[PDB]
Amino acid sequence: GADLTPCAENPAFQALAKNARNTTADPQSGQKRFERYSQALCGPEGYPHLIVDGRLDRAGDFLIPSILFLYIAGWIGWVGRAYLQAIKKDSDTEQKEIQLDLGIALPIIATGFAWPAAAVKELLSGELTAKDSEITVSP
Amino acid sequence: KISPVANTGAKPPYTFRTGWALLLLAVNFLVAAYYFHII
Amino acid sequence: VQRGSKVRILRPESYWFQDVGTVASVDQSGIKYPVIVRFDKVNYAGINTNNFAVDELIEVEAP
Amino acid sequence: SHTVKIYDTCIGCTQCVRACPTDVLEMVPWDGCKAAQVASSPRTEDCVGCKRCETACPTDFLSIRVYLGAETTRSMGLAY
Amino acid sequence: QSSYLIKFISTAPVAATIWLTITAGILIEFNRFFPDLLFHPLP
Amino acid sequence: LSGKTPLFAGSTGGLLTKAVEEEKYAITWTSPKAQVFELPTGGAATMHEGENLLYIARKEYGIALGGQLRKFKITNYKIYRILPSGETTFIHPADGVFPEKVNAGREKVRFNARSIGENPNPSQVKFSGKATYD
Amino acid sequence: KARVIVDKDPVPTSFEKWAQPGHFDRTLARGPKTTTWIWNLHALAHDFDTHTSDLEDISRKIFAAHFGHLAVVTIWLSGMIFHGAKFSNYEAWLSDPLNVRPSAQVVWPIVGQDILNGDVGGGFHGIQITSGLFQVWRGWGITNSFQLYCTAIGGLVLAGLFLFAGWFHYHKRAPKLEWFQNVESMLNHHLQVLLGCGSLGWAGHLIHVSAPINKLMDAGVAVKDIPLPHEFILNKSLLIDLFPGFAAGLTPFFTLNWGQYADFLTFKGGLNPVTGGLWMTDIAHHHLAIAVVFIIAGHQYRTNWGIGHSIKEILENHKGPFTGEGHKGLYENLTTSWHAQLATNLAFLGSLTIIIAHHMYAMPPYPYLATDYATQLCIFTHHIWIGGFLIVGGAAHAAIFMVRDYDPVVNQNNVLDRVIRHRDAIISHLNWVCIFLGFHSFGLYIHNDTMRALGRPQDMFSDTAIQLQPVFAQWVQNLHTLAPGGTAPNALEPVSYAFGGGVLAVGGKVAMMPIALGTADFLIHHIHAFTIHVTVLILLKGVLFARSSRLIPDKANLGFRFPCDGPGRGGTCQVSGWDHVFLGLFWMYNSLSIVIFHFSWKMQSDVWGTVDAAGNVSHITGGNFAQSAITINGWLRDFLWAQASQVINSYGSALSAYGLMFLGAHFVWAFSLMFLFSGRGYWQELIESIVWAHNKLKVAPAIQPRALSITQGRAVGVAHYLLGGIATTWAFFHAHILSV
Lengths: 139, 39, 63, 80, 43, 134, 740
Ligand code: CLA
Ligand code: CLA
Ligand code: CLA
Ligand code: CLA
Ligand SMILES: CC1=C(/C=C/C(C)=C\C=C/C(C)=C\C=C\C=C(C)\C=C\C=C(C)\C=C\C2=C(C)CCCC2(C)C)C(C)(C)CCC1
Ligand SMILES: CC1=C(C/C=C(\C)CCC[C@H](C)CCC[C@H](C)CCCC(C)C)C(=O)c2ccccc2C1=O
Ligand code: SF4
What we know:
The structure is cut from a larger assembly and holds seven protein chains of seven kinds. By secondary structure, chain A is mostly helical.
């Protein structure tokens, strides 16, 4: 909290709420917007402010979006990492990169929901990191 | 080939690295404690 | 090293330095850098092959 | 002026000489048992320095380099 | 043949266009029903 | 030095003041036929059936021309260097053998027995007057 | 010996080659070992000359590729009129073209973007349009939506026919090389049928449909009261009431009593007072005169009946004392190389497109176009830019002809060989002209810009000070104002009120007035001449020196597209014909950008503005052009800083997208500077370190990643530099003029 008030009681917020300019086709989209934003904290200007402190009182701001991202993003990286590794054993690696082998990819895309488990498994004992001595380097 | 490009000579736990880093981390929580009014 | 063996180069200033490569041929002569190798990754010029000496090489896997 | 230095990784492809615009490089017989040909750079005074010799070399890194240096009329490509 | 058509769809652009349009349509369609979503409302 | 000039009307692209003051060059060749060939500096010119001779401002014009001559199956091209005092020097096929082909009489020059990685560092050689490429 | 020669089923129609890429080239067909293969795939897709050497295979691809291109244009053109049918206010716009703004685009009620559908007018919520399609349809006599709905389906049908043609030709029925080489037949057909008959046909539509209908509409009748076009044809009583010349019929035509058609084939040459636009009868008489000239002109060439000209004989017989063999060999070059034909067609087509933009603003040829300043400004700006790009393309393919298709045997002592053999004198003098103009065009601004800061307004180059008047143009102006009477006697009013004459007022607006030329126009016209000469120097140099130079004797062997040819000889950077085109585009953009700026401020200051009943014309910017356009700070102040107020303040209103695209355009311009200033060498070493992190975590790509090629980095930059530039003034021109 710094130079702010609750959004529900702030006058400048209520001033903007009367003229909300509904976004979607729904007529009440404007009033429905300002209703939910009353929970957040607002400043003198009348717009809401988010606090990414990490306090559980206000976690929907950044913390819940933060967790939802990393589960989605690690899905993409684990899938890409596994699809790239599976191709390397095959003969024609470069063509499969451009012309995707969907038979190999979609089973991998079916997985990835449990990417944190496989990540920890490779970290504890496996292939998450190659040795520095066996990687190309400049002089 | 006079000097290797990769260094070696350490063990799994890395006691010296963890000791100083955990100290730096302990200070960070102490600052957070005053901010959250834990102390 | 015998022909058909995977080999890890140790020569600096090589694009494939600290990378594995097969041995396509060896020359039974007094020539320096007699061993011929081939890699999957191409260099900046796209040549994919170059000759190297015996001391610049490790036998990673058997032929 | 521009020094052209050749190293031991030559294999006698002769692709450097064919690319020289000014005929600076000339193959010479390697007395050793490597091959009957290894490159040389006798007429280095006419080296303009276009690096065509380096692009044509098939080694991992070059068997022949072109270290630039002092400039002259022949090197700067001046017809005036 | 159909085997050739599938390879054309599996290439980089067509696979990217088909996938990104699907991810785009989801965010697009979700945003018309659930309008604003500045944050997650906490009970 | 003898020969006939290629027949062309002339061109601004050509010889300049440098030729009078320092080191004009020349190129000589002989062809059985009389074709049309592009000159080194713009334009097109015919060539006579015997002992064609052309004056060029640099050495690069000649070898660039010689490469074009090889398309017409002409391999006897000789380049000279004419100084202001009239001194001429036979240069490009310095021996009877061309450069790409090997000849026993020649010697290696500016050859380093080591590889590029083995060259010394600059800090090892500073204020001595020597370079790393030596 | 014109003949239809065709090969039956050369190329099959399998889907196999779709899957495997790089089929067209052998180097790319091997495999994608590297990411540069991807970029090279697109850069070599249309390089048919690199795919094969047989001109039959090249021409068949080109002739069929054109058909697929036409389908794209027809789908586009059919798409525009379709939007006018379903989502538009055109039916309401005809009721009041002066109070309702034109709109045909509607964006859906999704996140925050329903704002763009503001109250454009006529009870319709849509984006305001500046292409001017509404004025065209009124010129076409379209008065209802169903009529437009029918035309759109016809274009889509026409699109399939063109699409069917390219399939039928490349695969089933491929013409041979002889079919394309009969030039004398091609030119007769295009002049007579495509241009002559097409012009003659449009005269029929104007005479029967547009001219009568528009003559009822400007009178004041309701849109519903207007009969349909077929009603005019069947019922001649309605047609005779407006144009009584039709009562005589077609007999005055055949009997050469052509004066009876004077009612609807006039030569007034002025603008319609009611609707700002040329008279439909004058436009009706236009195409009829054009068709006869084109139909007659196309019979010049032989086309296999012994009667006509051989173009080879015309060119060869035009020799002279100065030119050795004249135009001998040009016919062979133009009949053995597609690039030469492409260079000529592009260059003069681009100059044509610029020439259109100047005619249209002074001679508005559509109804109510002049009063719509927004349509008029974007229309001029549009074709001005497209012509600039096409001219630069002409120089590129002109140089590509040299490296690829030049034959020294053909071009021996001809007009072209003689041009290359004195190229130094051409450029050295053009170099002198470019310096002379840049000093005496821009230096006069600095002298004014410097003097006004020093408090010395008397020492400036201004209308009160030293003024350099454009006497030559003012003389040519008076000749046009006096063309009514004397020379061109039958003309009642001049060809345009821009040259001079009385003012024209539509509603409260001004359609056109005399454009007075003072010291400011004398300077800007020289600025244009300065900037035009320099891009010619850049482009013309690439053409002559693409084959060889004093620095590089063998430049053709390296090709049209090579980065440097080494770092020696000082530095040989950007020595190719390609890089000249890359540099010329910035100067094309520099020159063309002042033209539209000269147009915007002059027309707003001197021409456009509200007009009172007493003739008092309250111009938009208040005549500030004369005393402010002489200094650079005046443009920065009065043009850029002032007129951009509508753009930045567009937030929270219907024009908010223009403020966004305006601001976003500056980004892409600056993002361009990454690739222009930098070099491939740094970026490859950066990717090297990033590849290590992937080799660490075993995410290493099989296709080894490499930085972009050198010529690509230059190409990628100029693409951004121009896109980010043009989009900026695009939004500024739009948001400013649309508000005012
Ligand atoms: C009826 C279906 C059909 C089929 C099966 C084929 C099959 C073939 N054609 Mg063919 N062709 C067709 C219709 C067809 N064509 C039509 C209708 C035309 C007239 C335009 C042509 C004109 C044509 C030419 C001129 C050539 C071929 C060639 C080929 C062969 C290689 C094509 C390839 O792999 O590239 C596949 C490429 C694509 C699928 C991309 C095509 C993109 C389209 C045409 C344009 C899209 C424009 C779009 C609006 C731009 C938007 C940009 C922006 C939004 C991003 C192959 C046998 C080539 C050949 O034989 O090589 C020797 C060749 O030179 N065809
Ligand atoms: C009639 C018009 C026309 C035609 C038929 C051609 C045809 C050709 N040109 Mg060419 N050119 C033209 C106009 C034309 N050009 C103009 C106007 C210019 C000046 C800009 C050039 C400049 C030019 C150069 C500099 C070169 C060619 C080359 C070529 C050849 C190969 C091009 C290629 O592979 O295509 C494929 C081309 C690409 C994939 C490039 C894509 C560029 C995109 C479209 C730019 C983005 C613009 C877009 C509107 C931005 C908004 C949308 C975006 C944000 C999504 C081919 C014969 C090349 C060649 O080697 O010829 C032998 C070559 O080096 N041309
Ligand atoms: C504002 C930036 C700027 C300026 C001033 C110039 C200036 C010039 N460019 Mg250019 N150029 C630029 C940006 C610029 N360029 C950019 C960004 C590019 C990349 C696309 C290029 C690419 C480019 C090419 C490719 C070419 C040029 C050419 C030219 C020259 C044209 C001749 C001319 O106008 O006479 C000279 C005019 C001026 C210098 C204008 C200002 C001079 C004032 C009025 C006089 C100064 C007063 C006084 C004497 C000062 C004395 C001070 C004392 C204390 C010393 C000129 C030197 C062309 C050329 O050289 O052909 C001859 C050419 O081919 N340029
Ligand atoms: C990564 C580093 C970075 C970043 C982020 C910026 C950021 C900025 N620079 Mg910049 N700059 C940098 C480094 C950077 N600079 C460096 C190193 C230099 C060299 C010194 C410069 C040189 C420079 C110049 C010379 C200029 C800038 C400008 C700008 C501004 C761009 C204006 C704009 O678009 O507003 C941001 C607003 C938007 C993006 C919103 C509008 C666009 C909408 C959203 C379009 C739709 C986008 C859509 C999602 C994607 C398109 C898809 C479609 C194609 C299909 C912005 C503040 C320009 C400026 O405006 O300054 C006044 C300018 O002229 N900079
Ligand atoms: C709590 C909180 C906070 C804080 C945070 C932080 C400070 C953190 C950091 C963290 C860190 C300091 C960490 C680090 C890490 C490292 C690493 C090392 C990473 C990475 C890993 C890996 C190795 C990866 C791999 C992978 C995976 C796993 C999956 C996907 C793919 C990939 C391959 C990528 C804040 C204030 C913001 C907010 C509130 C709350
Ligand atoms: C930045 C820069 C680069 C580097 C630029 C690069 C490597 C551009 C890379 C473009 C994209 C990001 C490549 C990767 C695209 C991905 C494969 C797409 C992923 C798929 C999803 C988007 C669907 C050069 O190579 C260069 C060369 C010469 C002069 C200047 C420059 C220069 O400025
Ligand atoms: S290695 Fe290079 S310098 Fe040696 S012969 Fe081959 S091309 Fe010539």
